[PDB]
Design a protein around this ligand. Structure first.
Ligand SMILES: CC[C@]1(c2cccc(O)c2)CCCCN(CCCCCCCCCN2CCCC[C@@](CC)(c3cccc(O)c3)C2)C1
Ligand SMILES: *[C@@H]1O[C@H](CO)[C@@H](O[C@@H]2O[C@H](CO)[C@@H](O)[C@H](O)[C@H]2NC(C)=O)[C@H](O)[C@H]1NC(C)=O
Ligand SMILES: *[C@@H]1O[C@H](CO)[C@@H](O)[C@H](O)[C@H]1NC(C)=O
Ligand SMILES: *[C@@H]1O[C@H](CO)[C@@H](O)[C@H](O)[C@H]1NC(C)=O
Length: 528
C-alpha cells in the first residue's frame, strides 16, 4: 500500500488527503523522540523507543504547551496562530506530505515554525504542506519542538536543564528525517531546512552548530537570523531568568537541583502563567526563554563564529517583509491599536523607542531618535508611527539579517536575497500595519491557490512564483529555472522584491539604517 511505510522505528500508516481537486498522502503525528514528561522536563530529548504494530499517522499530533494569545478573542488574524489542538508536554511529533504516486528520490523540505521560541505549532492552517508538496512535487516535513521554559530554561552546568533542548528537539527530528525519509520517497541528501522568525533563527543556528551541520543540505531563512538580538542570551542571563522563574513560584532556590525539582512538580500552566515576569527590561520583541550561548551547541560567540567562517558552507536563500515591526508595537507600545490609524504623539514615540531598544542608555535613545525623526515635520503622527515601525523591524529583523548575510557570503557557496512587500488583499489586520511579520508564509505555503480563501488571481500567481523559487532552490541550490533572481555577492549586494508588480532587482538593502544598527550604535554603547 501507498499509505503503509516501513521505517527504522517501525511501520507507519497514513491517510489520503484531497488537494486542489487531486489527492496525496499524509503521515501525521509520527513520534521522533520519547515524550519529554515527568522527570524528563527540561531534559535533552531521547530517541523514541521503536514500537511494533502499525503507527496510526492519520491525524495531527498535540501542540507543545505554550502561552496562548488572547489579545483579540474571536479575531482570526491572531487566533489562527494559536494552538488548534490539545496542548501537552507529549508533543515531539513530525508530519510528512508525500506526492502520489510515491516518489523514489525527490527533494525534501523540512519546515521549522517560528513564534519567538515561546510559541508555535506544526499543525496550523497556514503550515499545511499539501499545497507545496503537490504543486512542486517535494516531500514536505514539518517538525515540532518544545517552546517557552519547557524548551529553553537554562541552568548552565546542570545536566538536568542545560538549555537549548528545544534546539535539540529540532535536531532529532532532523536525525530522523536523515535516517528514514528515504522510505517515503524523499532523498536524504537533498534536505532543505526552512523557517520563519524563530524558525528562521533556528535554521541559522543549525548552520552554525557543529552537531547539526551534517544533517541537511541547504537552508532558507524567512524574517529571522541566528544573531537576532531576541534570539539568544548569555548563560548568566539564562541562569538569572531561570532563578527568577523559580522565585515567581515560591521555589526553594538554594541549589540548581532544588530549583529544577520545584519546576518539575508544577503544572504546565503554572510556568506559563508567570513566564513573562522574568524579562529584565520593559521591552517589545523580547522573549523569556530562548537559546543560550553555552559553549556546546554554540562553541563560541555567534559573532566570532561568523567572522572566522566557523559554519556550514552551502547555499542559502533568505529575506524579510517590508514592515516587520508593526505586530510588536500593536501588542505593546502605547498609542497603537488594532482599530485606529494609530497616529503617534511625540511623547508616545519617545516611549516606543525606549521600549524597542531596551538595553540603550539615554545617549543611545537620542541617537536612535535622531536617526528616525524627520526634524522638518516632527509632529506628523503617520511619520512617528511609521518611523517607530521601521525602528522595530530594522533593529530586530532586517539589520541583523543583513549582518548575517554579509558575513555568510564571505565564505558560503551562494546567497539569494528577497524583500517581500505585497500586502494581501484579504488581510484582516489594519492598513497601518503594512506588509506584516508572518504574512509571507501563506504565499510560501500556497494558500492563495484555494479559491474559497479569496485571493486575487495576481496573488495566486505570486504564490506560484514563490513556491517554485523555494522548491527549485531546494532541489538545486539556485531558485532560477535554466527573468533572473541574481546571486547576492559581497561586491554588488543585489536582491529582488516579491510582489504582484513585475519583479525588479535592487541593491544594498537598507544600508543607511543597518550601518547605524550594526556598526555605529554598538560602538556608541561600548564606549558610554
Ligand atoms: C510565527 C508566529 C507569529 C509570531 C509570534 C511571536 C513572535 C514572532 O516573531 C512571530 C508570526 C507573526 C503573526 C503574529 N504572531 C503573534 C503576534 C504576537 C506578538 C508578541 C506579543 C506578545 C506579548 C504578550 N505579553 C504569530
Ligand atoms: C560553489 O562551489 C562550487 C563547487 O565547489 C564552485 O564551482 C567551482 O568553481 C571553481 C572556481 O571557479 C572552478 O575552478 C571549478 O571548476 C568549479 N568546481 C566545480 C565542481 O564546479 C562554485 O563556483 C561555487 N559557487 C559560488 C557562487 O560560490
Ligand atoms: C486512527 O486510524 C483509524 C483507522 O485506522 C481511524 O479511525 C482514525 O482516523 C484514527 N483515530 C482517531 C479517530 O483518532
Ligand atoms: C470569502 O468571502 C466571504 C463573503 O464575503 C467571507 O465571508 C468569507 O468568510 C471569505 N472566506 C473566508 C474564510 O474569509
Amino acid at each position: 500500500s501507498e499509505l503503509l511505510v516501513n521505517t527504522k522505528s517501525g511501520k507507519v500508516m497514513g491517510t489520503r488527503v484531497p488537494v486542489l481537486s487531486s489527492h496525496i498522502s499524509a503521515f501525521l503525528g509520527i513520534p521522533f523522540a520519547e515524550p519529554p514528561v515527568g522527570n524528563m522536563r527540561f531534559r535533552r530529548p531521547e530517541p523514541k523507543k521503536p514500537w511494533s504494530g502499525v503507527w496510526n499517522a492519520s491525524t495531527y499530533p498535540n501542540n507543545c504547551q505554550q502561552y496562548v494569545d488572547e489579545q483579540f478573542p474571536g479575531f482570526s488574524g491572531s487566533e489562527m496562530w494559536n494552538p488548534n489542538r490539545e496542548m501537552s508536554e507529549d508533543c515531539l511529533y513530525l508530519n510528512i506530505w508525500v506526492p502520489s504516486p510515491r516518489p523514489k528520490s525527490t527533494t525534501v523540505m523540512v519546515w521549522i515554525y517560528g513564534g519567538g521560541f515561546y510559541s508555535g505549532s506544526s499543525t496550523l492552517d497556514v503550515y499545511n504542506g499539501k499545497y507545496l508538496a503537490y504543486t512542486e512535487e517535494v516531500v514536505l516535513v514539518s517538525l515540532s519542538y518544545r517552546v517557552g521554559a519547557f524548551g529553553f530554561l537554562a541552568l548552565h552546568g546542570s545536566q538536568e536543564a542545560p538549555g537549548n533542548v528545544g534546539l535539540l528537539d529540532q535536531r532529532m527530528a532532523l536525525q530522523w528525517v536523515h535516517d528514514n525519509i528515504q522510505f517515503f520517497g524523499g532523498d536524504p541528501k537533498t534536505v532543505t531546512i526552512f523557517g520563519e522568525s524563530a524558525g528562521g533563527a533556528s535554521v541559522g543556528m543549525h548552520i552554525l552548530s557543529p552537531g547539526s551541520r551534517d544533517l541537511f543540505r541547504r537552508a532558507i531563512l524567512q524574517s529571522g537570523s541566528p544573531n537576532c538580538p531576541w534570539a539568544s542570551v548569555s548563560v548568566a542571563e539564562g541562569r538569572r531568568r531561570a532563578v527568577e522563574l523559580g522565585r515567581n513560584l515560591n521555589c526553594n532556590l538554594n541549589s540548581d537541583e532544588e530549583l529544577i525539582h520545584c519546576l518539575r512538580e508544577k503544572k504546565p500552566q503554572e510556568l506559563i502563567d508567570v513566564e513573562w515576569n522574568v524579562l529584565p527590561f520593559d521591552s517589545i520583541f523580547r522573549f523569556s526563554f530562548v537559546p543560550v550561548i553555552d559553549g556546546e551547541f554554540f562553541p563560541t560567540s555567534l559573532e566570532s563564529m561568523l567572522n572566522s567562517g566557523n559554519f556550514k558552507k552551502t547555499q542559502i536563500l533568505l529575506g524579510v517583509n517590508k514592515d516587520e515591526g508593526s505586530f510588536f508595537l500593536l501588542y505593546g507600545a502605547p498609542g497603537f491599536s488594532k482599530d485606529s490609524e494609530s497616529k503617534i504623539s511625540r511623547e508616545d514615540f519617545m516611549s516606543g523607542v525606549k521600549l524597542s531598544v531596551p538595553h540603550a542608555n539615554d545617549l543611545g535613545l537620542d541617537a536612535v531618535t535622531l536617526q528616525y525623526t524627520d526634524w522638518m515635520d516632527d509632529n506628523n503622527g503617520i511619520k512617528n508611527r511609521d518611523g517607530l515601525d521601521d525602528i522595530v523591524g530594522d533593529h530586530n529583523v532586517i539589520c541583523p539579517l543583513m549582518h548575517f548575510v554579509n558575513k555568510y557570503t564571505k565564505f558560503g557557496n551562494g546567497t539569494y536575497l528577497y524583500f517581500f512587500n505585497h500586502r494581501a488583499s484579504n488581510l484582516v489586520w489594519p492598513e497601518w500595519m503594512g506588509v506584516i511579520h508572518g504574512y509571507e508564509i501563506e504565499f510560501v505555503f500556497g494558500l492563495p491557490l484555494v479559491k474559497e480563501l479569496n485571493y486575487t488571481a495576481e496573488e495566486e500567481a505570486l504564490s506560484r512564483r514563490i513556491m517554485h523559487y523555494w522548491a527549485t532552490f531546494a532541489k538545486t541550490g539556485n531558485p532560477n529555472e535554466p527573468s533572473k533572481w541574481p546571486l547576492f555577492t559581497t561586491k554588488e549586494q543585489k536582491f529582488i522584491d516579491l510582489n504582484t508588480e513585475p519583479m525588479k532587482v535592487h541593491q544594498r538593502l537598507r544600508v543607511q539604517m543597518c550601518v547605524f544598527w550594526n556598526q555605529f550604535l554598538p560602538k556608541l554603547l561600548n564606549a558610554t
